[PDB]
């Protein structure tokens, strides 16, 4: 693992992409290295630290949701339209059909936990939309503010049972949602 | 349209490709033919990343060369193999392989199947190993004079030869300071515990191996003493500040006296950890992770010098030197884990950097080479030569045998197996003698490099090298003359020579068994 | 049975089962439970209190057979209550001949089916 | 006409195209057959090169876009899986007899007749091989295995080195004796771990009387040699016990906070003492080990290895008598560790290799094991040596399990060819023509042999045919039937007395697989290729 010397570490950091160029870290590794940074530019690194701290506190101020809240047709108008300025929702319309509702329900809890920044709401099709066809068993109709932003209706759109944990992140984010910490379009396979 | 194989697949077959393979090896043997001998010539290599490598050894030349011909790729892999296994004889093995293929091509043309050539090559390899073991002489390990002579023989053909009388000593010291006895058996000699570090600028002979460890760190706090006479060093792996943990805690506060109580709990935890460290009375604490402000304050109140994050290899060599032991949980920091024996700890300033020395320690098992020179490339070449000398010293301490140098042993084994082949009969005798005169290139290479005429000199050498136990007679490449290597006094470990011969013959077999090439397709 | 949303086997559970010298098999599709019950005679169990020996199938032998290094199979042979169900296993060099053999066997079975349907 | 939106090739055109594809694959693989044929050198698109001789590797690395050749590649892969030897021979047989059958069809003989002839000829050939061409490897002991390994390695990069290799090869197989149904010995090959190293010559390859896992001690300070090893194989990571995905702690008063944090390590710590309370001396685990646990192990004077591969740990536990543990939980509700589940090894040493270090577990107490380390000039030579060694191990296993071998060097092929030509007079029908063709097809293997050695193949195959004719038509000359061609002087010599034997499994499986591949590729009457 870390049984590698200075030359080996330089070789690895050069081979990975190019270099970390002492400008692209979070509050963790720029804080832990803490000694490779040369001392003639303390003001620049401290200004960067203060701006990143401001960014972190701003992000934590708007991270207040944490988990999905499920609603009925009564308040559906308010959480589909009056959810807030600069916030978009998920609106997973689900039933007790086992496969796709079950998988998506288990995955959305994890996504909401790891994204406390975006609203997750799930509703049952019977009492949210009058006489929904119910053949298109999944339904995540993403609303940007109150308008259409994306739509996933068919199990073929997701791909059926073969759904992993985090490719849903990319599927939601491709429409313009919060950025991803993951690469590759269809999460490899 | 209609295809069987891929569109991009190309195929080559027949003697054509065989010739190509041989030629490829010769080309690889042609780049670094002038780098062999005490009169070698430096070569400059331009890295794709902007660096420059100014070197002599063959491996450092080939590792910077990319070849799309797969036979040359095999030759480069052979060079890396010889560099890693023994650390010496790269140019010798590459030249030997090149000339063995070059002489096997002649038999390939004369409608001879490669299999008989391979069999003769293997027989020649076995016989040359036998007769190379025959002419060997023992070496006295306890004798330091002969050790210095062997390292001089290994270093006379590099750029630091002018400082050989220094450099050899350095290598010897390091190799005789890492020598360790493991649990019961398993004597070891590892270069992970022999670090060479380059500090540009200064004087080359100012370089020396320190009786201890040097790292490029600084004291955590200004008030902590930068000069410790007899340190008691404790080595830490974990961190000395407060960390969240692993599970999700999410402490809930409803009272007025829980927030400040939480913060005071963090402070008291740091205080308790530092008091656990302090109670056993250390003097220097080395940690691989960060140090909290409270941590260094509490350590300082007990007059302890704290060195912040240190790479794990440096901590391992520090532990091996001082005799200490790394502990992650401070509450289990035992008395036996405290490092006593470090003769002096000094935070010196070199150029515009702070360097910490734990030198003067008793009977260390790890060393650091203060290698001071003039430039980064000069120091890189110096440390490469030091690594070669270290590898040769380890080879001769693990093998008490020696063999004459300057192409004397090669000519001796060539003549021995030539006289062996003169009695047998068959079709395999011709490749046998082909290998016999194939081992002859390196003396010829030395004579060519020194600037003398190879024809008459090598003819005289071969003629005189036939009678009256003259197997130690070789060429002096400084004066380009024929000398008896006993008076000249250049000897090489038997391991290096036998490994060179084995690797050359095996590379010849590998590139001679091949007759078809299919190029261009998906990985799998 | 193959249970998504909840690991039907845990490391602790498998450890205990192996300690009691038992054979455990997982990832059984929901569509095959009727076939298994009709073949060997077991009855599905969805509650621990209902798990008894009165609804536990029996067989003379259970084996894990290796096909000369070309896969692995589970064979249950000698069921004490032989149901109206048999199974056919096919062998072949390449996939194409195996598929064609399957189609030919199916055609023969359909011919016998037609002969059973109307006797002429 | 047809509205298919595709390309249709019907009649003699598609038959000729399929035969061309099969012949192309056969000619690709044919140059590397026999103790004289050389090996091929495949370079990929990226540039990585592999030096290979066995047909299976060549055909898997190659990419083919014709079904009539994909079937041949699949046949080679199947022969590798089922047997392990004769991967090139089966492809050569299949393609050449397919060419012969297409030639027969060209005279307007129905392909059903030639398929029936091939089926009957294959059945008769297998029967003749079983009856009048096998010798029991019972009177010959410890030498039939050596000869089989030698003749399996002759064509490889370690050919004349076989005397050094074959010996140790059988030793490896003799270290994996097993009992399954109390009276049937079993040889679970692939349980011998093959290690690569690119240091010394080929004579320095090591046969270790004990498993040699390719890992390193967890921490440098831990001892690297154990005089008497009490191995404790584990299958769980020794890291701080994070609670669970579901269980999550919630603190109301800070006075109860710090304590639980101690527990977050102590649990793990506790486990370690239990493992070390029984005198465990070496610890092997598939999961990771954190720094604190490494500190416990180094302070206890016992070496610990992390991230050991599951198959390696399984083999170590089987060989040393240790019991692999997924978790510490007995039939009661308390964690415990018992001395009854520690394997015993006479030595465990981290031995240095060309540049790195690998761990040798020597003289495991429970049952003898073995491992092989291959030293070579570079990576390509070592990997080719590993492939050849795998082929040799497979051959020795086949010989030991099925105690019967047949003469090599084209003896069985010539005998079958002459018998099948003497056959086909039983039925007297037109289908007999097919059988006759099959006979001639079984002459391909000897021919190409002498083709690779630049010898006069026609004279050699004529001499083999004459000798086998004399053997078959004269009962007292039966000893002539064990004869095959030889390369050192281009002479037909008795390979039964010379020491060239191949397990009958290779020949039988190759014949059956080849004839069924030819049948399944010969039924084609037209090809309909649809547009992507
Ligand atoms: N003064 C000398 N006179 C003649 N030959 C020498 C002398 N010093 C070294 N040699 C020979 O030159 C060879 C050293 O060449 P070197 O550059 O070390 O090759 P490599 O790069 O392959 O290690 C040795 O084989 C030795 O026999
Ligand atoms: N020493 C030998 N003398 C004569 N024939 C041999 C010898 N060794 C192997 N052969 C023959 O060469 C044929 C090809 O075997 P080989 O190509 O090495 O196996 P594979 O087909 O698995 O690559 C075998 O049928 C065998 O009879
Ligand atoms: Mg040298
Ligand atoms: Mg073979």
CSV table of C-alpha atoms and ligand atoms in Angstrom, one decimal, chain B residues 88 154 157-158, ligand 3:
chain,number,residue,atom,x,y,z
B,88,UNK,CA,25.9,-5.7,-12.2
B,154,UNK,CA,33.2,-2.9,-9.5
B,157,UNK,CA,34.2,1.7,-14.8
B,158,UNK,CA,31.8,4.4,-13.6
E,3,LIG,MG1,30.2,-3.0,-13.4
